[PDB]
Amino acid sequence: AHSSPA
Amino acid sequence: AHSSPA
Amino acid sequence: GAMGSMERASLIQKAKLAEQAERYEDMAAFMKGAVEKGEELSCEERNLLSVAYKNVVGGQRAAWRVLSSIEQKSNEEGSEEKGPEVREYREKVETELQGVCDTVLGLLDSHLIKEAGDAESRVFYLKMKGDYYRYLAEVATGDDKKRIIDSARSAYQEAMDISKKEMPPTNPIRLGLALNFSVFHYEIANSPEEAISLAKTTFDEAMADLHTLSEDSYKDSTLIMQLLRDNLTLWT
Amino acid sequence: GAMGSMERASLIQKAKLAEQAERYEDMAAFMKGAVEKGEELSCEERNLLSVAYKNVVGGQRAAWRVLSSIEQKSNEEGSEEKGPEVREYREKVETELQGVCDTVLGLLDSHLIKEAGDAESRVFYLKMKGDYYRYLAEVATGDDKKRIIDSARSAYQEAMDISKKEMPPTNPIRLGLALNFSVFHYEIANSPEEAISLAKTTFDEAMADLHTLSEDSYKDSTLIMQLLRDNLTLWT
Ligand SMILES: [Cl-]
Ligand SMILES: [Cl-]
Ligand SMILES: [Mg+2]
Ligand SMILES: [Mg+2]
Ligand code: NA
Ligand code: NA
Predict the structure, then answer these.
(1) Which fold has domain D1-236?
(2) Which of C45, D38, D66, D101 is deepest in the core (most CB within 10 A)?
(3) Which residues carry this modification: Phosphoserine (chains C, D)?
(4) C152 near C133, Cβ under 8 Å?
């Protein structure tokens, strides 16, 4: 799953 | 320029 | 600390140079030094801190996953014994990963969170606390796995409560928090339905608020909304 | 050394694991530990040593180039002064890069080269000596730049002399040596005509020997020949 990018 | 790959 | 003799502004300048050079370990050390000056961080500086440690721990997590997969295969039936080396090296990477997470959590506890009064800073730091406990949870296996999971949950929950009261549903910090809390539910907490519900409600409430945004803010918000959609497509 | 307590075979095993995990600093430390056991290296082990340090120094060189470019721009006319930080950080990366090159050169001098009697091992190590002096030359600016350049040239030349006498023109070590010596001529020694001549003669003599090779050796040789061709296309 994708988590938040900086 | 390209040098040798390992 | 090795950065104690360097000016705060010079540390920030060098963090930005390290980012351009893709020297993320250096970047993290510079930003740790900046935090330890004791002043609060601006929005841009918080982003630099997050970028640096995200990239450091990201490489460690990717390496840990490779090694864990090799180790699991070595423990199947018919697998020829190869000795302690796979476990040893996986443990080495794991310990270094845990050290980085502990470092970040230590900066948050001493004393970024307690000084953060504005919603934007407090939510950012509490989200980071949840994220780094989540990374600890990814590798946890012993008696304290449950407590690590609950520490991540508690931080995310406090951040969610503040963000819902103080931020619009399109705020990129709020969106990224909800995205990551949903990943926590799916991958850590064995709660796929909660993960799906959170992603869908977050997406729908942001959609309804996009009309209030400028073109630039619209781009920022929709980028994170697409990640929620991508996860929903993976999970359903 | 921190690897002194680990078995040679365990160090080699962990170097291979580190490669799979893209943990090249770990890989280099493992292979340094293996070299320091004092036994000669097999062909596969030499490759592991080369892969590890190539990737470590490769990241350092890429970072140094980014920082050097920023530093050069800061020294143009009309550029606003930003203080010592760019130079300081470029020097930091440069010093770490030089340290890695010195480490590799130290392993070659103590005592890989002197024990290497077969053409394949001796040429490999002398090529590596030329390569790491070349990386030192890329960042050298003081009184000893000329001596660093001549050290690279001398190592490459000894390797070339052995390779031409003892190896077929399609040997991948011989080909990669000639490729790298040609890059040295073009980028370090200000000798573009020598670089072009070497690349063209190397390519043509390999072409004439391909008919002697198996399919697998043919693939190995043509891969490096394509890099010679790519450089010739860039340079002409
Ligand atoms: Cl280990
Ligand atoms: Cl520095
Ligand atoms: Mg068997
Ligand atoms: Mg001006
Ligand atoms: Na073993
Ligand atoms: Na400055």
Answers:
(1) Delta-Endotoxin; domain 1 (1.20.190)
(2) D101
(3) 10, 79
(4) yes
User: What's the gap in Å between the CA of A4 and the closest CA on chain C?
Assistant: 5
The resolution, in Å, is 1.5
Domain locations in chain C? 1-236
* Long-range CB contact pairs, C63-72, < 8 A, 24+: C63/C93, C63/D21, C63/D22, C63/D23, C64/C90, C64/C93, C64/C94, C64/C97, C64/C138, C64/C139, C66/D20, C66/D21, C66/D22, C67/C93, C67/D17, C67/D20, C67/D21, C70/D17, C70/D20
Q: Hey, are the CB atoms on B4 and D47 less than 8 Å from each other? A: no
Please give the radius of gyration of chain C, using alpha carbons only, rounded to the nearest integer: 19
Tell me if there are at least 3 CB pairs under 8 Å linking chains A and C. Answer: yes
Instruction: State yes or no: cis peptide before C111, omega within 30 of 0.
Output: yes
**DSSP one-letter code for C11:** H
**What technique solved it?**
X-ray
Tell me how far apart the alpha carbons of residues C229 and C207 are, in angstroms, rounded to a whole number.
12
